[PDB]
Amino acid sequence: FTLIELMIVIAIVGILAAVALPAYQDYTARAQVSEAILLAEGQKSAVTEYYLNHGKWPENNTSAGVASPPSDIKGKYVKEVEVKNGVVTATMLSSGVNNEIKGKKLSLWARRENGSVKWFCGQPVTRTDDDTVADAKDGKEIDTKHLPSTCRDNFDAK
Amino acid sequence: FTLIELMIVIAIVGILAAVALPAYQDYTARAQVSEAILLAEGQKSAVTEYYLNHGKWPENNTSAGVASPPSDIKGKYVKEVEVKNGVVTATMLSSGVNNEIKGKKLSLWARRENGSVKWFCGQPVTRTDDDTVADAKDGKEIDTKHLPSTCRDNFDAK
Ligand SMILES: *[C@@H]1O[C@H](CO)[C@@H](O)[C@H](O[C@H]2O[C@H](CO)[C@H](O)[C@H](O)[C@H]2O)[C@H]1NC(C)=O
Ligand SMILES: *[C@@H]1O[C@H](CO)[C@@H](O)[C@H](O[C@H]2O[C@H](CO)[C@H](O)[C@H](O)[C@H]2O)[C@H]1NC(C)=O
Ligand SMILES: [Pt+2]
Ligand SMILES: [Pt+2]
Numbered sequence A, B: 001f002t003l004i005e006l007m008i009v010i011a012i013v014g015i016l017a018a019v020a021l022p023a024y025q026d027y028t029a030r031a032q033v034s035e036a037i038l039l040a041e042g043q044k045s046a047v048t049e050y051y052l053n054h055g056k057w058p059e060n061n062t063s064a065g066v067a068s069p070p071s072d073i074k075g076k077y078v079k080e081v082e083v084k085n086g087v088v089t090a091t092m093l094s095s096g097v098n099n100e101i102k103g104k105k106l107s108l109w110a111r112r113e114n115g116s117v118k119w120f121c122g123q124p125v126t127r128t129d130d131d132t133v134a135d136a137k138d139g140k141e142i143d144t145k146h147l148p149s150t151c152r153d154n155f156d157a158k
Helices: A003-042 A044-054 B003-042 B044-054
Strands: A078-084 A087-092 A105-113 A116-122 A125-129 A132-135 B078-084 B087-092 B105-113 B116-122 B125-129 B132-135
Touching: A003 A044, A003 A078, A003 A087, A003 A105, A003 B003, A044 A105, A044 A116, A087 A125, A105 A125, B003 B044, B003 B078, B003 B087, B003 B105, B044 B105, B044 B116, B087 B125, B105 B125
Parallel strands: none
Antiparallel strands: A078 A087, A087 A105, A105 A116, A125 A132, B078 B087, B087 B105, B105 B116, B125 B132
């Protein structure tokens, strides 16, 4: 009459799952900031356009000509995507999202490579003047381990 | 779409089972030498009788008047129970039995407390003369951790 054998199969499948569990914990989180990155890249046409037609970065959602509140640029895991002086910043929600990335953010910004702009992707940045952004890391930025290698740009990237 | 939650329940039930598994491993083994002890205590009436009617310990199964081969005193986990000079020794099988106790043994022997005998239970012993046994530990004796506290007698017990 065999509990033991069953207790061995439960035991080996349950440590395998505990072993897997971190990897899938980190897989999901990368798929959840993947959307934030996509919601923010949607906004680059408008920003690029706005800067090209005028010489000035759009001050907000409404200048660039995208939905006036950021909360309307929201997804399954992103709460809001926001243009603030040509820098678009996506904030993760705090529901349906992994704890180490809930409520955190990344940013896309561009530099003029005179004739067009050059875009970058990375952790939050604030525009200081028409060609320089500065790190805006306040402790709510997506950790580097969850950012793709494409979106690892530092404030001074060129 | 939730693998994670399931992976957490599998993970917690599987470490609990790995935690339990030693205890139940040791539970079973105590229930398996429990039978060896019972198969050997069955044989004490005959041995006690034989010594009382004569002054000599029975030399074998056939003198004491129990089944001439020990292999016929066998159970679910015991292979054979054997009278050899008044000492009855039970050997565990090597199938249906836990590895740390498979093939190992214990022994019951008595001393004359003149008028009757006094019995003891413990790890194997060999009779040296009509009143002394000696430890017969050859490396095939049941470990102390699996012997009940009732069956912890040392060779020189009185
Ligand atoms: C759109 O982005 C421009 C970047 O250079 C801003 O000037 C612009 O603000 C100006 O236009 C609005 C129009 O209502 C207001 O008059 C502001 O006071 C102006 O500075 C900005 N538009 C918005 C709605 O902020
Ligand atoms: C039964 O136990 C006795 C203990 O004192 C032994 O002597 C006895 O052996 C003797 O009797 C048998 C009978 O067949 C043989 O004759 C032996 O040679 C005797 O020593 C023992 N009986 C057995 C079967 O060993
Ligand atoms: Pt304009
Ligand atoms: Pt006799």
